[PDB]
Amino acid sequence: SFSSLYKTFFKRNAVFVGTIFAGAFVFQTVFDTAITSWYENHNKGKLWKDVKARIAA
Amino acid sequence: AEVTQLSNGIVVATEHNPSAHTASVGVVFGSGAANENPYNNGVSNLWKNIFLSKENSAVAAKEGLALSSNISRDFQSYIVSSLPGSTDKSLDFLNQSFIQQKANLLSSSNFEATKKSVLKQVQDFEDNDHPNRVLEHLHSTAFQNTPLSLPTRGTLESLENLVVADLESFANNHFLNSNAVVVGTGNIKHEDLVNSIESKNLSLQTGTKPVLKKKAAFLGSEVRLRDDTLPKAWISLAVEGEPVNSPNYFVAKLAAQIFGSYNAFEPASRLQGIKLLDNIQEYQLCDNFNHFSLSYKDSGLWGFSTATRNVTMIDDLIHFTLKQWNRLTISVTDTEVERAKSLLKLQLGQLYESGNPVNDANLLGAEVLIKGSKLSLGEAFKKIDAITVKDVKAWAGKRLWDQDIAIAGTGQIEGLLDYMRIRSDMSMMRW
Ligand SMILES: CCCCCCCCCCCO[C@@H]1O[C@H](CO)[C@@H](O[C@H]2O[C@H](CO)[C@@H](O)[C@H](O)[C@H]2O)[C@H](O)[C@H]1O
Numbered sequence: 034s035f036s037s038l039y040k041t042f043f044k045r046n047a048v049f050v051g052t053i054f055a056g057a058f059v060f061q062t063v064f065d066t067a068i069t070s071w072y073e074n075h076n077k078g079k080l081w082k083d084v085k086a087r088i089a090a
Numbered sequence: 091a092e093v094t095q096l097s098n099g100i101v102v103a104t105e106h107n108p109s110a111h112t113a114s115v116g117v118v119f120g121s122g123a124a125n126e127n128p129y130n131n132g133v134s135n136l137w138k139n140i141f142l143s144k145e146n147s148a149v150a151a152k153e154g155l156a157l158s159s160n161i162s163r164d165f166q167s168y169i170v171s172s173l174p175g176s177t178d179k180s181l182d183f184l185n186q187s188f189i190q191q192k193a194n195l196l197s198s199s200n201f202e203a204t205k206k207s208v209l210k211q212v213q214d215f216e217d218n219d220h221p222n223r224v225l226e227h228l229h230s231t232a233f234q235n236t237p238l239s240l241p242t243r244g245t246l247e248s249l250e251n252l253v254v255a256d257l258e259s260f261a262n263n264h265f266l267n268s269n270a271v272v273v274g275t276g277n278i279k280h281e282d283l284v285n286s287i288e289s290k291n292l293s294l295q296t297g298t299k300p301v302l303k304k305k306a307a308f309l310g311s312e313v314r315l316r317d318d319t320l321p322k323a324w325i326s327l328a329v330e331g332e333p334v335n336s337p338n339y340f341v342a343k344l345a346a347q348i349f350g351s352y353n354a355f356e357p358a359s360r361l362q363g364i365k366l367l368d369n370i371q372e373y374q375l376c377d378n379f380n381h382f383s384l385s386y387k388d389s390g391l392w393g394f395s396t397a398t399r400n401v402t403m404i405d406d407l408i409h410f411t412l413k414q415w416n417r418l419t420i421s422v423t424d425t426e427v428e429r430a431k432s433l434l435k436l437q438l439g440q441l442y443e444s445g446n447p448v449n450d451a452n453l454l455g456a457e458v459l460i461k462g463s464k465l466s467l468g469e470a471f472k473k474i475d476a477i478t479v480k481d482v483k484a485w486a487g488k489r490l491w492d493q494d495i496a497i498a499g500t501g502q503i504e505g506l507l508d509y510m511r512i513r514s515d516m517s518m519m520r521w
Contacts, residue, residue: 050520
């Protein structure tokens with residue numbers, strides 16, 4: 034964190050609850066997508082989706 | 091009728107008062123305790139007392155004159171009072187003390203006797219004057235390691251180490267024509283004074299400029315002088331305020347007037363239009379309090395001082411007061427601002443339109459030294475009446491809201507909570 038970067042968004046005030054809650058909602062979405070993508074990529078070839086791609090009946 | 095200001099080498103300033111029955115002539119130097127160091131701290135106070143020494147006072151009394159001297163943070167004064175006719179006799183004494191004499195007042199017996207006198211003086215102040223001792227410590231912690239932190243009376247340690255040479259060094263460095271203003275108040279004309287001054291000659295260290303140093307800085311901090319043997323808790327608390335000649339000088343003074351002063355034992359004081367009074371009288375949180383807006387050349391302090399015997403509820407006293415301060419930023423009303431205007435005008439009028447020439451001398455000299463002139467009540471009142479609720483909120487959001495504080499206290503202060511609990515009260519939770 035850089036002082037001037039923080040000041041451009043909040044000046045010398047702490048972050049208010051309203052903004053904290055709003056940020057938590059955004060965090061939840063972005064964080065989940067990022068983790069899931071990294072996790073599925075790390076296990077590529079082992080997932081059912083990957084197996085179903087080749088295997089069939 | 092508008093305060094004259096003339097310069098021929100020596101800057102002379104007067105304020106004629108026709109209703110005055112006396113006259114005050116003296117010299118004000120633009121150097122005070124803020125121009126000393128931790129080791130010669132008290133040198134100015136020592137000078138004040140040798141000037142008020144018996145030998146010097148007896149000489150003045152024979153002439154029907156009275157001596158006055160005040161040691162401040164930014165300035166220092168030496169005034170002589172007399173009848174309007176004996177105004178020239180004042181100048182002779184003044185001239186004598188700061189041009190002719192030197193080794194007379196700085197003699198071994200006079201200096202030592204005076205030194206011993208101020209030593210017992212300062213010892214009594216530090217030992218018994220709790221509200222002022224606390225206010226002095228507020229300045230000390232708020233501006234620590236900075237010029238403004240030094241007490242005006244000096245410290246015992248530095249005082250007992252002071253010698254005649256220290257006095258001389260300070261005099262040679264600060265008692266200069268370029269750092270002075272000769273004042274004239276009460277019943278006297280400018281021409282009468284300027285011609286009487288212009289009558290003599292010489293210069294005594296001409297062109298010599300005073301010493302320079304580093305600027306004052308505010309530091310969020312605290313000094314706690316707990317003493318459980320004292321009957322009360324004395325506390326002073328403040329944020330960085332306004333320096334003299336600040337654009338918010340009056341807005342700050344008005345803000346302080348909103349919360350004002352209070353004396354629980356005075357019936358009318360309990361009836362003031364101050365919202366904080368509704369919170370603190372139920373369980374009688376304090377004996378008295380007074381808000382202030384102290385202004386100096388480099389900085390200032392805005393806050394309050396209070397004394398209380400309610401040692402178990404100090405936390406409520408502080409909490410309610412700071413919660414009220416919070417209001418200046420978000421909800422101060424129009425009537426609170428209007429009440430403050432009227433009372434501020436009265437305060438200034440009582441300060442500047444006092445019936446005392448020595449007071450006028452000190453104020454006149456101090457102001458002309460800082461801004462070259464003295465502001466009139468007419469202009470001051472106009473500025474005050476122009477202050478709006480938005481101006482107060484803008485100033486408070488800058489100086490009060492979520493800002494660092496300086497705290498000082500003595501006595502039974504066990505109940506005064508930690509710094510952070512007090513500091514957190516400088517704001518309120520918001521959605
Ligand atoms: C049980 C589990 C649930 C956990 C939920 C987490 C709770 C988060 C609450 C977050 C913020 O709540 C928020 O806090 C900040 C202080 O940090 C408050 O700030 C307040 O104090 C700060 C600091 O002196 C000031 O700068 C600010 O102007 C003032 O409004 C803000 O008004 C409040 O709205």
